[PDB]
Design a protein around this nucleic acid. Structure first.
Lengths: 182, 130, 184, 118, 117, 87
RNA sequence: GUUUGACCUCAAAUCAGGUAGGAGUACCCGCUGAACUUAAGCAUAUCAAUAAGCGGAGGAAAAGAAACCAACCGGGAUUGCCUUAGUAACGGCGAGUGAAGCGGCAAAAGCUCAAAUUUGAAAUCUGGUACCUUCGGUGCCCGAGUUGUAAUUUGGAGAGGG
RNA sequence: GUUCUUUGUAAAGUGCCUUCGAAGAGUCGAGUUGUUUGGGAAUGCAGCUCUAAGUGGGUGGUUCCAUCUAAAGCUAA
RNA sequence: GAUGGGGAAGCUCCGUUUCAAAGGCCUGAUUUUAUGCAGGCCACCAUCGAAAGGGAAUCCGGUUAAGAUUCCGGAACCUGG
């Protein structure tokens, strides 16, 4: 299908066609507000591979975040996700993807799913997000960007953060004392 | 605590509950035959050994036939739709057992059923009608 | 003086696209099937409008009613789905392809004419995705394609393909040069 | 010493040990009541450990490989319903281990009885 | 007054009794201020309260029958269990199984077995 | 109470101007007059013209407020919107 | 056609149907983040990846079915306890910091999408209405969708056929 | 345990033969700044210059070799 | 001091007209391919902030266990309809 062609083309962001598209969209978004809803995703393939669906209940939002940092320790992607989840409180954030960037700001597209809509509730493939445990997933860094920033992975490279740095630090820094002292 | 103080300083009354005894005495529910032979006095491993069924497949950590026959004994002890039957009857009336020609019957073999499927369906119909 | 913000934004976008140089992969549109041949294609395609929900529902109910009391070939129809169109393309099963020039995401349709010409499948660019939508019982499809057709319309389809090749494909093959958007 | 931190703030004395054993026994009894017909644990394979300091010791494994299940006369999808663990990411190398796993699967199949769907 | 008696009596009778009890309460209160005590004031007040409760129940039961069967019942008449229970999708939505999982379960149902022979 | 404005009580609010009535009804003059003809409503002339017309001497047409308010509940108003949507 | 509508974008209703704030907070997930104290007074350093402050959830939370560990006769989701080990290793190599493989045990369940045309029929579904065997089901109606809703499947491969 | 409904040229599972057979990008990576980790083999994290390939790529060990193949998501003890 | 926006991870800070689709008045025989709306005018835009600021209007006599431009008698004046 056309999804493979779009995926291949998007990888060549420096291409002339994508160069002009980005040069136009950067001004188009800058003329708009910092955060505004998008009628349709500008990168349908990326959203589709991220679990997005065209059925009712899915919303595409566009957000702008400043660049730079006398230091900062969180990704702009996570900040944008939090700033969009703090406005659509009734929407559950699943994932987000880069669509464009600027020298002073970066632009990211975030797909939002409403657990209140019956179509989502009646869909066994998406009703799992209706559980309250998934509330404000972006605020807890449970998204792809949040997990990447947290360092949740496997192997020696993530021992200090395999299951959360705070949790492992608390578990290891405890003087266990059994009834029958060893 | 601050809230616990009110529950005792007020006449609302605690929502008393008592279920500790039932936590240990659990009724066997997944099998009536086992229930007729199960004994809550003995442990799960002891009950399994008495009945004759292995309690654990893996090696037990640390230290350590009639019922089976009765359970085992009880272990040892589809048609065709109207339209499908009519279609098979039409095939039999027109081409009979000529599968080689029935496979190419556009009028009847609308779905181009394979020779094996046609013969199996015809055999089913014949067995269901003699 | 002041106008609505969205109106000003879209006017600025229009006057920028009219003045911004674009690579030949862009502006491959704006050289489109003429009004005459476009109308002829619409007339040919108007006879193969896909069965709407009401038509299919009534036909199925009528068939069921007859069945309750107690053979035709596949109905030829236009293919419009982008995933299905791109699947008929690259497989040589497609005979005629129509491409909308006013797709909002340009990247979704930039490669389609190039792939069609690479595969040697006739293709035509027609103004207005709504026009394609109006003939497909949808708001818009951005693409339309033809498959096996009735014998009566085979000659018409061949003549339309020849006309398209003579008018648009051969004439506008130079579109590779002359970077669009160069108007002063 | 390793006490320059506020270790006193996190000192969990394992007083629950006495009650934890009883809780585990009660949970096992509940599982037996619910899983009465079937064993509390699945049939695990026999495996040989890496780290030669321990390879000389034979130990159990996670689940039988697809090849072992196929050689045992059944399928991985069907074997799961019978209580046989299946490991899709384990590859058999030693022939003796494969033979032992096949023999264990055959013995389990011979020793099991499956109730009718009725 | 007794609740079981007012249930059978028509609504207009209860409405008239409400006004009669209000008049009686007013008269007793006029008498009460000139007396150290008046026990019947408590009884008449609790009878007025009972009459009001009976009238409210009679209205609510009729309203419930008015919306019988149809969806979107009045919020005050809906379940008061808790806020969270309105979420936590209901049994139908929770048990909704996708065709893939349903077919897989049907093809490979969990069997019951014992291991001794 | 505080000072009461002259053109806020009496004939000022007893009769509503035709232009104001159309705005309140949010219905086109064609449909508004169709409904008026169906209901047999007619304009009325108060004993004082300036008093009713917010103290302004103009050839304004006055309609009874109660009749117009009752008109708003007629199902014909919804039927007109349904017909417009269907068209 | 000096016209009409298709669209695409953007607005409004005290519109029909919904949801969000906040409180609590021992535990959970992140952000933010010092100093007292201690070492050759304190430059690296310890206190500390702590308290305070901020946001987000449940009865548990997180993680969880490998771009893992090992180098062997290979192990085979995650989590938790003992050991590993006060070891490897860091440490103005001074104070101190300090794991991880494997092994012993409590428990085990695996999976779902993208990317393949349903193309001999968008076969999908939100919502309003009349009924009923009312946590929902049926007929009718409007709309969402072709910039993709139905079915199969995804490294254990899988799919079209005999 | 008792009973109503199925059904429809409907929905599945295994063996053989045959024809095909699809890998997630501003992402890995490189140089740098600040922080953290025993993790010097630069452990990870965030920013910044550039930017990737598909019999291709990460990590480790004898001249090659072993494991996965991420950049999408759910899950009881 | 919201309002439309911007910065801030955030508790929140800026900004009062700031490049907002920010409302308030009138007319017509019912608007001609036939009963779906046409036309005329202005461009500011919430709120709080004073019992010593501006303000619509009561004077006298008498009365109480404590109240008077209020309570009683007489005669007055302002706003709306």
């Amino acid at each position: 299908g056309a999804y493979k062609y779009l995926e291949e083309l998007q990888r060549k962001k420096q291409s002339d066609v994508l160069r002009f598209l980005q040069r136009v969209r950067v001004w188009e978004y800058r003329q708009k507000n910092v955060i505004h809803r998008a009628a349709r995703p500008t990168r349908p393939d990326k959203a589709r591979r991220l679990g997005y669906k065209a059925k009712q209940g899915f919303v595409i939002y566009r957000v702008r975040v400043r660049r730079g940092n006398l230091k900062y320790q969180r990704s702009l992607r996570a900040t944008a996700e939090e700033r969009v989840g703090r406005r659509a409180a009734n929407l559950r954030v699943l994932n987000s993807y880069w669509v464009n960037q600027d020298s002073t700001y970066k632009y990211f597209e975030v797909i939002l799913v409403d657990p209140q809509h019956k179509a989502i509730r009646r869909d066994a493939r998406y009703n799992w997000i209706c559980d309250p445990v998934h509330k404000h997933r972006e605020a807890r860094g449970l998204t792809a960007t949040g997990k990447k920033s947290r360092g949740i992975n496997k192997g020696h490279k993530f021992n200090n953060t395999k299951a959360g740095r705070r949790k492992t630090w608390k578990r290891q820094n405890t003087l266990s004392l059994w009834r029958y002292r060893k | 605590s601050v809230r616990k103080r009110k529950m005792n300083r007020s006449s609302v009354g605690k929502a008393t509950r008592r279920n500790k005894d039932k936590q240990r005495k659990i009724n066997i529910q997944s099998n009536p035959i086992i229930a007729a032979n199960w004994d809550y006095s003995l442990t799960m491993a002891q009950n399994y050994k008495k009945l004759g069924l292995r309690a654990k497949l893996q090696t037990p950590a640390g230290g350590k036939e009639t019922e089976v026959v009765k359970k085992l004994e009880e272990l040892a002890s589809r048609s065709q739709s109207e339209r499908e039957e009519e279609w098979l009857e039409k095939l039999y009336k027109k081409h009979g057992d000529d599968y080689k020609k029935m496979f190419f019957d556009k009028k009847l073999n609308i779905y181009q059923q394979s020779e094996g499927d046609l013969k199996r369906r015809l055999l089913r119909w014949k067995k269901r009608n003699g | 003086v002041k106008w609505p913000e969205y109106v000003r934004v879209q006017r600025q976008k229009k006057i920028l696209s009219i003045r911004l140089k674009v690579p030949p992969t862009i502006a491959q549109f704006q050289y489109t099937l003429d009004r005459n041949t476009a109308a002829e294609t619409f007339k040919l395609f108007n006879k193969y409008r896909p069965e709407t929900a009401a038509e299919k529902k009534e036909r199925l109910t009528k068939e069921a009613a007859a069945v309750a009391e107690g053979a035709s070939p596949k109905p030829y129809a236009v293919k419009y789905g982008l995933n299905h169109v791109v699947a008929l393309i690259e497989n040589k099963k497609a005979k005629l392809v129509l491409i909308a020039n006013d797709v909002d995401p340009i990247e979704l349709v930039v490669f389609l004419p190039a792939l069609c010409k690479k595969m040697g499948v006739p293709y035509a660019i027609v103004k207005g995705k709504a026009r394609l939508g109006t003939l497909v019982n949808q708001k818009t499809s951005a693409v339309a394609a033809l498959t096996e057709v009735r014998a009566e319309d085979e000659a018409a389809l061949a003549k339309l393909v020849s006309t398209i090749d003579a008018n648009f494909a051969d004439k506008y093959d130079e579109v590779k040069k002359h970077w669009g958007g160069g108007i002063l | 010493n390793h006490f320059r931190k506020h270790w006193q703030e996190r000192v969990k004395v394992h007083f629950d040990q006495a009650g934890k054993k009883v809780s585990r026994r009660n949970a096992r009894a509940t599982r037996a009541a619910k899983i009465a017909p079937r064993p509390l644990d699945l049939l695990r394979p026999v495996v040989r450990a890496p780290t030669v300091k321990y390879n000389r010791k034979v130990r159990a494994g996670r689940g039988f490989t697809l090849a072992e299940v196929k050689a045992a006369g059944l399928t991985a999808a069907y074997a799961r319903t019978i209580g046989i663990a299946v490991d899709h990411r384990r590859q058999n190398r030693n022939q003796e281990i494969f033979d032992a796993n096949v023999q264990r699967l055959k013995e389990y199949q011979s020793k099991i009885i499956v109730f009718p769907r009725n | 007054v007794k609740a079981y008696e007012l249930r059978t009596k028509s609504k207009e009778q209860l409405a008239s009794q409400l006004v009669d009890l209000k008049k009686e309460l007013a008269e007793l209160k006029v008498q009460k201020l000139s007396r150290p005590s008046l026990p019947k004031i408590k009884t008449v007040r609790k009878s007025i309260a009972c009459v009001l409760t009976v009238i409210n129940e009679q209205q609510r039961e009729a309203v419930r029958q008015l919306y019988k069967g149809k969806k979107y019942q009045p919020k005050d008449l809906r379940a008061k269990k808790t806020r969270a229970l309105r979420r936590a999708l209901t049994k139908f939505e929770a048990s909704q199984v996708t065709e893939k999982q349903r077919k897989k379960q049907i093809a490979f149902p969990q069997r019951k077995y014992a291991i001794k022979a | 109470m505080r000072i009461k404005k002259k053109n806020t009580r009496g004939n000022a609010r007893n009769f509503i101007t035709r232009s104001q009535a159309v705005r309140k009804l949010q219905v086109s003059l064609a449909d508004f007059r169709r409904l008026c003809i169906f209901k047999g409503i007619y304009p009325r002339e108060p004993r004082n013209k300036k008093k009713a017309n917010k103290g302004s001497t103009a050839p304004t047409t006055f309609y009874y407020a109660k009749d117009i308010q009752y008109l708003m509940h007629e199902p014909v108003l919804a039927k007109f919107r349904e017909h417009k949507t269907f068209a």
